[PDB]
Amino acid sequence: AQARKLVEQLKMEANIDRIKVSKAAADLMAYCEAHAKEDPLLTPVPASENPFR
Amino acid sequence: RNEEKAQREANKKIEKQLQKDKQVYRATHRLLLLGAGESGKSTIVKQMRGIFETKFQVDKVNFHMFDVGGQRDERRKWIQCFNDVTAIIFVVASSSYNMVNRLQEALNLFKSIWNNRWLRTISVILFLNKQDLLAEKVLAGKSKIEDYFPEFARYTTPEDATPEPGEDPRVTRAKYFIRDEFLRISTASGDGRHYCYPHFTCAVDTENIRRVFNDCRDIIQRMHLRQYELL
Amino acid sequence: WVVGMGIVMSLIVLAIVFGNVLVITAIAKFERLQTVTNYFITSLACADLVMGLAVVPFGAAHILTKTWTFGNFWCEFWTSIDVLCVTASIETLCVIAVDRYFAITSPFKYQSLLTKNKARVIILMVWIVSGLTSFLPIQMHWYRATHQEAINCYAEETCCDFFTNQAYAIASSIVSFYVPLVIMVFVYSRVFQEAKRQLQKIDKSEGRFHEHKALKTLGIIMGTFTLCWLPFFIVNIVHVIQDNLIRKEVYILLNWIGYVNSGFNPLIYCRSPDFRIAFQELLC
Amino acid sequence: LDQLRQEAEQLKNQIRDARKACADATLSQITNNIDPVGRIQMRTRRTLRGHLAKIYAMHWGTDSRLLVSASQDGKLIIWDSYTTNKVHAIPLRSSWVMTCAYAPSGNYVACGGLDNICSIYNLKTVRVSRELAGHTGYLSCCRFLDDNQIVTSSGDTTCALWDIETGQQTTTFTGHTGDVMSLSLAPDTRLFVSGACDASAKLWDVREGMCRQTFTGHESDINAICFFPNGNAFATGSDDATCRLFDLRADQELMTYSHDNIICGITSVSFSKSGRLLLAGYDDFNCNVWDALKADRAGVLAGHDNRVSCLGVTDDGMAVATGSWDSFLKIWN
Ligand SMILES: Nc1nc2c(ncn2[C@@H]2O[C@H](COP(=O)(O)OP(=O)(O)OP(=O)(O)O)[C@@H](O)[C@H]2O)c(=O)[nH]1
Ligand SMILES: CN[C@@H]1CCc2c(ccc(O)c2O)[C@H]1O
Numbered sequence: 001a002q003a004r005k006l007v008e009q010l011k012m013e014a015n016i017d018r019i020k021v022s023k024a025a026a027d028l029m030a031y032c033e034a035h036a037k038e039d040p041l042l043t044p045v046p047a048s049e050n051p052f053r
Numbered sequence: 054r055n056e057e058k059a060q061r062e063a064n065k066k067i068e069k070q071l072q073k074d075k076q077v078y079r080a081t082h083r084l085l086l087l088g089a090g091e092s093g094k095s096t097i098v099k100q101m102r103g104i105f106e107t108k109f110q111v112d113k114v115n116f117h118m119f120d121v122g123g124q125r126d127e128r129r130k131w132i133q134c135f136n137d138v139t140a141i142i143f144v145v146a147s148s149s150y151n152m153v154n155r156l157q158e159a160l161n162l163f164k165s166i167w168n169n170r171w172l173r174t175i176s177v178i179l180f181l182n183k184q185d186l187l188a189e190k191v192l193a194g195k196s197k198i199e200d201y202f203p204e205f206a207r208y209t210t211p212e213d214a215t216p217e218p219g220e221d222p223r224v225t226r227a228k229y230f231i232r233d234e235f236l237r238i239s240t241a242s243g244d245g246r247h248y249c250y251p252h253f254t255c256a257v258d259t260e261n262i263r264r265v266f267n268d269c270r271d272i273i274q275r276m277h278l279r280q281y282e283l284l
Numbered sequence: 285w286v287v288g289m290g291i292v293m294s295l296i297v298l299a300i301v302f303g304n305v306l307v308i309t310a311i312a313k314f315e316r317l318q319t320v321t322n323y324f325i326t327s328l329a330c331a332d333l334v335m336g337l338a339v340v341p342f343g344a345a346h347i348l349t350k351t352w353t354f355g356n357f358w359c360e361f362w363t364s365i366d367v368l369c370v371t372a373s374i375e376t377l378c379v380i381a382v383d384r385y386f387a388i389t390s391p392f393k394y395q396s397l398l399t400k401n402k403a404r405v406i407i408l409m410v411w412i413v414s415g416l417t418s419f420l421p422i423q424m425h426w427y428r429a430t431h432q433e434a435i436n437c438y439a440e441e442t443c444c445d446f447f448t449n450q451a452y453a454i455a456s457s458i459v460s461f462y463v464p465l466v467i468m469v470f471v472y473s474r475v476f477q478e479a480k481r482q483l484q485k486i487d488k489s490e491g492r493f494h495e496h497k498a499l500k501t502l503g504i505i506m507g508t509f510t511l512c513w514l515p516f517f518i519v520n521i522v523h524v525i526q527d528n529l530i531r532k533e534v535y536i537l538l539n540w541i542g543y544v545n546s547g548f549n550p551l552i553y554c555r556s557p558d559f560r561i562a563f564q565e566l567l568c
Numbered sequence: 569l570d571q572l573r574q575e576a577e578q579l580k581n582q583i584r585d586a587r588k589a590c591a592d593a594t595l596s597q598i599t600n601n602i603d604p605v606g607r608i609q610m611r612t613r614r615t616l617r618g619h620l621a622k623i624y625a626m627h628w629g630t631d632s633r634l635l636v637s638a639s640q641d642g643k644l645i646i647w648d649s650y651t652t653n654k655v656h657a658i659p660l661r662s663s664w665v666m667t668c669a670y671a672p673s674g675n676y677v678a679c680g681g682l683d684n685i686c687s688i689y690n691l692k693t694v695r696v697s698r699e700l701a702g703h704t705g706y707l708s709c710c711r712f713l714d715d716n717q718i719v720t721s722s723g724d725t726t727c728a729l730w731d732i733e734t735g736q737q738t739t740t741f742t743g744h745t746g747d748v749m750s751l752s753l754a755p756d757t758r759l760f761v762s763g764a765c766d767a768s769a770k771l772w773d774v775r776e777g778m779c780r781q782t783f784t785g786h787e788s789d790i791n792a793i794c795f796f797p798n799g800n801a802f803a804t805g806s807d808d809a810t811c812r813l814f815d816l817r818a819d820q821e822l823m824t825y826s827h828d829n830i831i832c833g834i835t836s837v838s839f840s841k842s843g844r845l846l847l848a849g850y851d852d853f854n855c856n857v858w859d860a861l862k863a864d865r866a867g868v869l870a871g872h873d874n875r876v877s878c879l880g881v882t883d884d885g886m887a888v889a890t891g892s893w894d895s896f897l898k899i900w901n
Pocket of ligand 2: 363456457460
């Protein structure tokens with residue numbers, strides 16, 4: 001009943017495709033390394049360019 | 054050049070308005086109305102007059118009340134927003150000691166509210182409502198307290214307790230027994246920060262507006278006395 | 285011998301300066317401590333710091349060397365600043381007592397009656413009244429004495445003493461000590477009555493299931509002030525009415541016992557947990 | 569009937585078996601040869617005053633200059649970070665507000681609270697432009713998906729997608745059990761997540777209107793959630809003093825951030841521009857900075873006299889702002 005929707009809904013979550021954890025970790029590490037030099041919080045900027053100084 | 058001059062006027066106007074509004078914010082005292090089901094909050098607030106508000110003034114003092122019956126929920130998480138109120142008003146139906154039990158649920162609710170982490174320093178003004186139906190049930194009634202609360206059988210009225218005029222001893226004994234169970238929870242874990250103020254009010258009574266005023270004044274006086282280490 | 289007294293005086297000066305500078309720094313640095321009541325306390329701390337940095341060291345030097353080695357103008361300035369500090373370090377206590385009285389007896393109107401605007405006006409008025417009875421009668425020669433010893437000592441620039449006529453001696457005492465004393469007594473009596481009534485209410489309400497703190501607090505607050513300052517202002521009036529009743533040494537001793545009160549105010553008015561936490565961080 | 573309830577479990581297990589077979593290693597094992605970023609010290613730059621009561625919400629502007637904030641005295645104030653001078657002061661009909669938002673185009677501002685009504689204001693005309701009603705509980709968050717449609721989550725275990733022009737709900741999301749505390753939109757504004765009060769986070773589809781995944785890692789209420797810049801991960805902060813980084817494609821968590829000296833809940837979570845530093849606000853009146861790749865603490869942002877209840881990072885990644893119950897806003901850098 002209400003359960004049937006629940007059964008149907010849960011069955012829906014079963015039929016998906018999953019990738020290995022190593023691939024996801026490699027992708028996250030690659031993104032973080034690629035954009036590692038374009039943020040001020042990690043790498044401090046010269047005091048001239050800081051607008052709050 | 055012109056930008057700073059333009060911004061200065063706006064800043065000055067906003068600051069002046071905030072300075073004006075600070076006084077009216079500080080003047081008013083906020084209360085919270087919280088009661089059990091079928092207790093009688095509506096008649097009390099009506100006699101006083103998803104959210105309901107009320108503003109009233111006594112002796113040139115502004116009070117401003119908050120009913121929260123809209124989001125009534127089994128689980129309360131909006132209780133965090135109310136840690137800055139002056140007092141909490143609790144309305145409980147005294148005559149419903151055998152129906153649905155209901156008084157046990159009310160006592161559990163009071164115990165849960167009392168020991169909340171965010172409401173450690175908030176007092177409670179307690180109105181034991183429906184005072185006439187209780188007398189009607191007690192005076193020659195089929196159902197008596199000992200049947201539902203076993204401890205009532207041995208209990209007797211305090212000697213120093215002062216009964217009202219023309220009151221049967223049985224009614225007074227039951228009425229004080231009901232109050233004792235509520236005060237027992239408060240005295241257990243108070244530790245001096247907050248107290249409880251029991252009262253006996255019906256629907257017809259109209260002097261509650263003075264009781265709330267006096268209790269708020271006493272609460273503020275006790276807070277100020279304790280702050281300076283004299284109490 | 286002389287050195288031991290010298291050794292003490294240094295400890296007194298160090299304590300008086302250190303406590304007050306710590307209190308002022310703690311109040312100034314932290315945002316939480318700013319309050320309407322904390323303006324009076326910082327005014328008192330500033331007055332005590334001025335006293336302990338100005339009048340105690342020069343007086344100690346004079347008593348050790350037994351001869352004033354500065355000019356007449358300098359010791360006149362010293363007398364004026366000493367009287368100013370003494371008469372400004374008591375009306376602040378009176379104002380604090382009155383503020384507590386308003387806060388306790390009239391809780392609803394406390395917010396409206398005392399605001400950040402009125403506190404500055406009150407402090408300025410108190411300081412102006414204090415400086416009106418110190419510099420005006422001393423820089424002008426209205427307070428000077430007439431008898432032979434005083435006029436003989438006035439011209440000499442080696443010794444600077446304190447000789448006054450009856451009028452100034454009585455008037456300064458009335459302005460500085462007794463008027464604050466009666467106000468503080470009446471205020472604390474009313475405050476004690478309020479606490480007694482509230483304890484009676486609580487005991488009547490919930491005595492079955494379950495006055496010392498107020499007595500101790502009032503006792504310390506009144507006793508420190510009265511014991512420190514009361515004996516001096518009796519002999520101050522006495523030595524004028526009676527010519528030879530009181531010697532010089534007893535007068536000097538009572539006066540120096542009076543100065544010690546400036547070293548106990550931080551230990552009395554700054555025992556709140558907020559102050560303790562604030563001291564923790566600044567200290568460490 | 570009975571068979572149907574029984575029928576479901578073979579399904580729950582298949583899910584568990586698939587997730588267990590998917591895992592091959594832990595994120596810590598791979599992320600072990602990276603040089604640490606080192607100790608990080610942040611200093612206060614600006615402090616904004618003017619709120620008479622405690623603060624619940626704030627939201628940085630799209631231009632990285634302006635921001636909005638709400639307080640329990642019933643007042644919305646728009647600031648200017650550079651010059652620290654107020655711009656607007658909008659009074660509120662109800663004194664209880666729990667959230668606020670700021671339009672991407674900088675033309676509208678939304679706010680809602682304990683009354684079950686969402687309000688919208690027009691900055692460039694300041695009068696109420698639209699009021700949205702239909703929820704049966706208090707609101708918790710609201711985000712402008714665009715200039716014409718807003719998505720909100722309420723305390724009645726539902727979320728909705730509104731239409732400002734007509735004022736009626738378009739799609740309704742259901743499936744949660746307890747209250748809903750927070751949400752965040754994807755960078756492409758096609759998917760959004762939520763954090764429920766029953767220790768579960770779900771990934772929704774805006775266009776379809778149906779749930780796609782569910783994560784059940786935590787143990788207590790989930791109070792905040794933030795979405796990874798890449799778009800394939802998100803971080804949740806619960807009331808049991810832990811943070812977790814999940815993954816949509818792997819459909820399971822990777823790392824956890826916890827320490828033995830804290831027993832306080834977490835009220836806010838945010839990322840940096842590059843996704844390396846994860847900032848969380850605690851009930852100990854201070855803030856902590858983590859390392860998203862190593863679970864090693866890298867700094868503390870202290871200075872607030874009461875609990876931290878709001879946190880945000882500029883779109884240009886120049887500064888981070890904090891709000892606390894002490895009615896003060898601080899700009900760190
Ligand atoms: N005998 C008696 N009846 C009362 C009293 N106060 C309220 N009632 C009755 O109790 C009924 C229900 O209480 P209401 O006054 O409606 O308050 P309520 O909104 O039901 O209270 P909640 O359900 O707790 O919100 C009303 O129809 C009243 O007639 C009282 O003092 N004495
Ligand atoms: C140098 N000692 C002075 C002498 C007289 C005097 C003092 C303080 C307050 C007064 O009102 C006085 O008249 C003493 O501190």
